[PDB]
Amino acid sequence: RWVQFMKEAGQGSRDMWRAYSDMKKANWKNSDKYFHARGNYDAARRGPGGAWAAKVISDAREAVQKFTGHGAEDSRADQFANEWGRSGKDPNHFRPAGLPKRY
Amino acid sequence: RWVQFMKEAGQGSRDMWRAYSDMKKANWKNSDKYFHARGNYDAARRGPGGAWAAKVISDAREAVQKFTGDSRADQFANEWGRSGKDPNHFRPAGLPKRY
Amino acid sequence: RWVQFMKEAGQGSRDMWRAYSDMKKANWKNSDKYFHARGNYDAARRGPGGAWAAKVISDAREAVQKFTGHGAEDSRADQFANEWGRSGKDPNHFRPAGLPKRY
Numbered sequence: 054r055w056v057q058f059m060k061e062a063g064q065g066s067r068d069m070w071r072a073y074s075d076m077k078k079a080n081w082k083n084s085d086k087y088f089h090a091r092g093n094y095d096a097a098r099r100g101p102g103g104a105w106a107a108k109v110i111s112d113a114r115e116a117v118q119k120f121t122g123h124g125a126e127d128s129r130a131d132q133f134a135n136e137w138g139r140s141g142k143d144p145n146h147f148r149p150a151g152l153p154k155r156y
Numbered sequence: 157r158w159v160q161f162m163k164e165a166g167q168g169s170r171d172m173w174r175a176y177s178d179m180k181k182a183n184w185k186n187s188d189k190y191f192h193a194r195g196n197y198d199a200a201r202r203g204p205g206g207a208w209a210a211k212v213i214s215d216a217r218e219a220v221q222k223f224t225g226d227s228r229a230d231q232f233a234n235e236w237g238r239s240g241k242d243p244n245h246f247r248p249a250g251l252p253k254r255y
Numbered sequence: 256r257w258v259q260f261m262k263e264a265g266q267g268s269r270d271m272w273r274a275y276s277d278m279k280k281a282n283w284k285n286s287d288k289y290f291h292a293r294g295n296y297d298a299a300r301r302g303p304g305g306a307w308a309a310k311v312i313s314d315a316r317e318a319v320q321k322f323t324g325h326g327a328e329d330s331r332a333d334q335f336a337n338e339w340g341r342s343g344k345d346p347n348h349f350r351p352a353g354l355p356k357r358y
Contacts, residue, residue: 055220056176059213063169070162109311116303117260219312222275223319 061102068095068103069110075156086134087147087156094138104139111135164205171198171206172213178255189233189246191255197237210238263304270297270305271312277358288349290358291333292340299341306341313337 072092076084089111096107115128138144175195179187192214199210214234221227237243274294278286291313298309317330340346 055217056173059216060173063166067162067166074159112310113260113304113307116307117257120303219315220319222272223316224323 058100058102058105061100062106063102064099065096065103065106066110068092068099069107071095079152079156081149081152081156084149084152084156086131087144087149087152089131089134090138090142090144090147091156092138093135094141094144097139097141107135107139111139160203161205161208164203165209166205167202168199168206168209169213171195171202172210174198182251182255184248184251184255186248187251187255189229190243190248190251192230192233193237193241193243193246194255195237196234197240197243200238200240207238210234214238259302260304260307263302264308265304266301267298267305267308268312270294270301271309273297281354281358283351283354283358285351286349286354287333288336288339289346289351289354291336292344292346292349293358294340295337296340296343296346299343309337309341313341 069092072088072095075091076088079088093107093111095103097104111132115132118128118131134147137146172195175191175198178194179191182191196210196214198206200207211234214231218227218231221230233246236245271294274290274297277293278290281290295309295313299306313334317325317334320330336349339348
C-alpha cells in the first residue's frame with residue numbers, strides 16, 4: 054500500500070528529526086557525520102518509506118547547507134555519511150570518542 | 157518552536173492514518189470523501205504542523221493517483237476539512253456515528 | 256529560512272504538474288522527454304527548493320510507475336530527460352516536430 058509506505062516515511066522523518074535533536078543536545082565535537090549516519094540508518098530500517106524520507110530530507114538539507122556556504126567537500130562528506138547509514142552500515146564507524154551511550 | 161511544529165505534524169499524520177483506517181473498517185459506500193475531509197479536519201485542528209502534514213499526505217496521495225492514472229474531487233474534500241469546514245458535509249447515509 | 260525553500264518547492268511542484276498536464280492534453284507522440292525536461296527545467300529555475308522538488312517528483316514518478324508496467328528502458332530514458340532539464344539544458348533539444356508554441 055501507499056499507506057504503509059507513507060507510514061514508514063512518517064516514522065523515518067521522526068528518526069531524522071531525532072538525530073538532529075540529539076546532535077544539538079549533545080554539543081559534541083565532530084559528531085555531525087555520526088548523527089547524519091544514525092538518522093539515515095534508523096529511518097531506512099523502518100522500511101522503504103523510511104529510506105525514502107531519509108533521502109528526501111538529506112537532499113533538502115544538503116541544498117540549504119550549500120546555500121549557507123557549506124563547502125563542497127563538507128557536503129560530500131556529509132552525503133557519504135548519509136548514504137552509509139541509509140545502506141545499513143554501522144553509524145558507529147563515525148562515532149567520536151566518548152560520545153555518551155545514549156546517542 | 158520546531159519541537160511544537162513537529163509534535164503537531166506527528167499528531168496530524170496519525171489523524172490521517174486513523175481516517176484511512178476508519179474508512180477501511182467502515183467499508184461504507186460513498187464514504188471516501190467524508191474520510192478525506194475528516195482526516196484533514198482532525199489534523200488541521202492539531203495546529204500548523206498538523207495542517208502541513210495533512211497537506212503533504214493529501215498531495216502525496218494525489219501524486220500516486222496521477223502517476224498510476226476523481227483526484228480533483230478528493231482534493232476538494234481534503235481542502236474542505238483542512239480549512240476547518242464540517243466533514244459531515246460529505247457524510248453518507250447510514251455511516252456509524254463513531255466515525 | 257526553510258520558508259523560502261518550501262516556497263520554491265511549491266513553485267517547482269506546480270511547474271512539474273503543469274508539464275505533466277501539458278503532456279496529457281498535447282497528446283503528441285514522442286514528446287515525453289520534452290515535457291519531462293521542461294518540468295524539471297522550469298522547476299530548477301525557481302531555485303534550490305524547486306530543483307529539490309523536481310527531483311523528488313521525478314524519482315517518485317519512476318518508482319510509482321513501476322507498479323503500472325513502466326520498465327527501466329523507458330523510465331531511465333525519462334530520467335535522462337529529467338536530469339537534462341534540471342541541469343539547465345534546453346528542453347527543446349527533445350522537442351518533436353510540430354509541437355505547438357503553447358508548450
